Structures are given as C-alpha cells and as structure tokens.
Design a binder for this molecule. Structure first.
Ligand SMILES: [Zn+2]
Ligand SMILES: [Zn+2]
Ligand SMILES: [Zn+2]
Ligand SMILES: [Zn+2]
Lengths: 330, 330
C-alpha cells in the first residue's frame, strides 16, 4: 500500500523517479551528535545535503531511499530536515550494516526481529518516523551474526511487507548465499534487492538471480578511481572499472530481458565519517554531479547506446514503486 | 579549584565521598535512544537509577564518576536527570573504550585529541555538560588504535588537567604498558588511575605501579560468581574470587604504605546492554546493595580487619578529590 517516508506515507503515484540506494550521511551511531565539527558543522552538512538534493531534484529525482541503518549513523531528524528543505521524498531504513556495536552484536535473532519491527511499525527513536526498507550486509561468506541479521530482516519483511536491500561483495557472489538464507525463511525474492551488483562483471550470476525474481541493485555506477589509481584508499572504495563499464551492465540486463528486475542508484552521500577523513571530497572530485549522476550522465549514455526512454522510465519510476509499496509478493 | 559535573562546576568540599568508577548505563552509542525498550523503557531505567543513587546517598555517597564514554553509550542527558532527582553529583567522561565504531577507529591521534578536548573544554553533544575525566581501555597489549587513544588521552589531560582512568585486563598486567605509553607522552602518574586492578592477586604488580605514583583502581570489589560458577557468562564477567579477597587488597596496599594511591569503587550500573541480555538482573542478584556496597559492606569489613575509619575516609573522600581536581601534577 503506502510507502513510509520521513515526512509521512506517500502513494505510489507520488514517488516518481526514485534512487533506491543513497545516503544523506555515512557515519556511525551517535557520531554526528557527538562530533559535528568533523563535518565542519551540522549546519554545513545540512546545507550541503540540501544543495545536492535540490541538484538531483532539478535533474528529475523525486524520491531517494536512504539505506543508512542504525550503525551507519542514520539521523532521521537530519533526513526529515533536508527532505523538507529540498522537497525530495526520503525513505528511511532499518536493519544492520557491518559496524554493529556490542549491544547489537550480542542480540538473538528474535531480539533483532523485534528491533527492526519497532523501527518499521512504531518509529525510529522518539521521532515517529517509520522505516520503509530494511538494509543488511555481507562481505563474503556471512558471519554468524550476519546470518542472524539476514534472518531477522526476512522475518520483519514477512510481518510488514517492507522490502529488504543488501550490501554484497558482488565479485564473490554473496547474493547467492543471501538469497539462499532469505528463501530458507520463506521470503519472496520480489521483496529483495541484491545491491552493489554492478561491482561484478559476472552476468550469469546477475541474470540467474534476476530470473529467480530478485531485484538487482546497480547502485555503484559513478564509483571509479580512474585518474587517481595510486590513491589506495579511494581505489579500494571505488574500484578501477569505469562508470561506463558499470552502466553497460544495465544495458546487458535490459538486453537479456530483465528490465523489470533492475534498480539503479549512485550510492552517494553528503557526509562520510566511517573511512579516511576527506573521502567525501575525493568522491565529489570524482563525481561532481553527486546524486544527479544517474539522470544526467547514465540515462543519456544509455539512450545513446539505443535504450528507449520508456525502458529507462520503467527502471527509474515503475520498478522502485513496485519494490517499495508494501506486500509479501510483488 | 572546581570539578565539572553534569550539573556544572562543584568544589572539592562538595564532592565528598566519591565512587570513582561507576556507570548509570553500560550500553553502546545511540542504543538507549534507538531501543529504549531493551531496558523496559527509558522511564524504568531512570527510575531504577534514581532509586539506586538515593540508596547510595543514604549510605554516605555524595558523588559518582560515570566513566561511560561515547562507545559505552553515555547519555549525559540521562545522567543529568538522575543526578537531579537523586541529589548525587555525577562526573561525566570523555575518552574511548574498547568498542569504538568506524568513525572513531579511523581517526588519527590529532583528531582524537580534538574530540576529547571538545568534550572537556566545550561540552558533550549540544548539552554544555563538560567531562571531568578521560576513560581509556586495553585488553592485553594495546592495538594500534588503542595506542592512539592512550596518547590522545594523555595529550588532552596535559592540556586541561583532567585525569585519565583506565580499563585493564589486570591478569595480563596491562597497567605496565599503559603507564609506559603515558610516560612516553610526559603524563604525570598522579593524573592516572589504573583500573580493574583488584582483578589480580599479584600484589607486586600493584605495589610497583603505586610506587611509581599511579592511582590504583580497586573498582571490582562486589564482582563474584561464587554460587553461580556454572553460569559461564557471569563467571567470565565476574570471576570466581570473593568480594572479601578483592577487598583485602585495599588493606594490603594500606599496609605497604600506599593508602594515598588507592581508589575504590563498585563498577556498578543500572542498565547493561553490551553483554548477555539479562546480565543486569544476575548482577543485582549477586550484589543487592548495588553502589551502596562500598559504604555499607566494604568499609565496615575493613574496619573489622583493623583499618582506621580515618584511613578509609582518606581513600573515599580525600584521594578522589586530589585525583579529580584539575592539575598537571597532584
Ligand atoms: Zn554498501
Ligand atoms: Zn550504501
Ligand atoms: Zn571496564
Ligand atoms: Zn566500568
């Protein structure tokens, strides 16, 4: 039915062009509140986010999905502030990424399910803001704790119709184990996006997941260290495959008939504290378009390669709404 | 001539009987605000803390030092609320414990120094509440990041006069490496408490540190799994030595001539989320007196063993004031 955003529930008709894997700020729980000067100031960070969201809106974006979890330092009051100021819908997330503190990593699968349900059904912190997606992660074979998180996320999705989206080490085919765990919980693949999937060139892996009904998150398109290859930290984060190579995976999935299974995004952010201090600046140097990279650079690139505009509208408008609108089977 | 508390500056005389290593809630950054129902509710936690602090005050306690850092989930607004309701002074902490998130673990020594200084000189979050102690931790030989933390803590102490207090694995003699690192930064031992030191029976380790001018934190006195040795999680936390064994270390150091170097506490808490779910209840079963254990049980026990009350007042009143009152050399 309706999709919860930080300003309240919206209808499918209202979502419009949606970026399905983004961030306002990539941090850690408590960090923005304890050390705002890391970001210059809270005001500076908010201003930067508003400018970038307005940039994206001007390029046609209407909704982003902020897949920052508790342990990414999600601050839903910041999300609400910038959503209002930029007039861009923002869907907030629950789940856990790969920096859970002791108070999360000691919890059982039932306890984690309760937490994710709280954030979806009741609200985040004392804000009343309800999550519209559940984010989870692996980096290779799931750790024991990550298996509990995947199972809890599946259970929370099965109780609410709120989809699950993942971080993968795509080149290691993590999506297969994630899918196997999800299906062992009875979760429908139509409620799951296997993200960071443009990090691999293995089209067989991607098409096989798409044929099983998964959504394939091609969310790293602007990530490339070309021109800065001997920046070790940037190379590790961004890789050295070109944005064009990544974008051509969108075309390849289209050409093999899987347009309904594709979700595209930038995995952008406006603040970034969980890595090297000035990674945000390096990223902004790599992709000055920020969140507008998909509409301004990727869509025209794919048009030039012969992809019809109606296909691209299906990917960027129709697929996200079908993914986000709550259901147990889409 | 003043010590910062969660209710503002206090004089040395106002501090009175002081417990130097305690917690209101042992958690993780952001956790109490995101999942208060873990604790029943925030109201239930606060009520529990006020009841316990009122009982400690009735037993003679006037101040506690809450050594919860950012990564212990310190919520200075909760400390301020319970301090007011119970009429007990609470000193808040900066520093980092052994569960830092990525946004902390990626920082340099200079950045950490700036963060600890912000918390001491400016305030914690947006609250205006300034830290009066710096807490650090090792569990065996320091990791590279923990070396940075210790160095940053020494630098912040050298710039402000606020003392440093530590978590150790006393069985591993961590106090010796901590001392070595601190002295390599020029920090006076008179500004350092080596905590959890009652976790060892190795008197020579303790006396050698005391002879160098360190404060010796005998802060685990009520910790014992005697009667519940088959509870593996409680035994790992609490050990299998009796409270009387731990308390007799106080006497041993007095007898050697080191009464000036002793600090005593309970390392108690009113909420605990960073371990097994119901550890708080197990702890309360072990020590129903909570923070009042030191004045109600340990002081009379040491008097029965022949220690003058005046020596015990020196330990519980005079030594904490000398430790906390800012200086570069006490
Ligand atoms: Zn990711
Ligand atoms: Zn991301
Ligand atoms: Zn400790
Ligand atoms: Zn402690």
């Amino acid at each position: 039915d309706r999709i919860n955003t930080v300003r309240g529930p919206i209808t499918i008709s209202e979502a419009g062009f949606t970026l399905t894997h983004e961030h306002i700020c990539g941090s850690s729980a408590g960090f923005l509140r304890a050390w705002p000067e890391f970001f210059g100031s809270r005001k500076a960070l908010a201003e930067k986010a508003v400018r970038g969201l307005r940039r994206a809106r001007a390029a046609g974006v209407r909704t982003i999905v902020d897949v920052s979890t508790f342990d990414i330092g999600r601050d839903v009051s910041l999300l609400a502030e910038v959503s209002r100021a930029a007039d861009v819908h923002i869907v907030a997330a629950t789940g856990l990424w790969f920096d859970p503190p002791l108070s999360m990593r000691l919890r059982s699968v039932e306890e984690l399910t309760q937490f994710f349900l709280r954030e979806i059904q009741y609200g985040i912190e004392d804000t009343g803001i309800r999550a519209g997606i559940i984010k989870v992660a692996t980096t290779g074979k799931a750790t024991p704790f990550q298996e509990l998180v995947l199972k809890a996320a599946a259970r929370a999705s099965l109780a609410t119709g709120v989809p699950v989206t993942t971080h993968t080490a795509a080149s290691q085919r993590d999506g297969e184990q994630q899918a196997a765990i999800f299906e062992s919980e009875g979760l429908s693949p139509s409620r799951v996006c296997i993200g960071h999937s443009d990090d691999t060139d293995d089209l067989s892996y991607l098409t096989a997941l798409a044929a099983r009904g998964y959504l394939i998150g091609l969310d790293h398109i602007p990530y490339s260290a070309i021109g800065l290859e001997d920046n070790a930290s940037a190379s590790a984060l961004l890789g050295i495959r070109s944005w064009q190579t990544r974008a051509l995976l969108i075309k390849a999935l289209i050409d093999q008939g899987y347009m309904k299974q594709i979700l595209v995004s930038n995995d952008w952010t406006f603040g970034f504290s969980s890595y090297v201090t000035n990674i945000m600046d390096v990223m902004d140097r790599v992709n000055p378009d920020g969140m507008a990279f998909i509409p301004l650079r990727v869509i025209p690139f794919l048009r030039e390669k012969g992809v019809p505009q109606e296909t691209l509208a299906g990917i960027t408008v129709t697929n996200p709404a079908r993914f986000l609108s709550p259901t147990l089977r889409a």
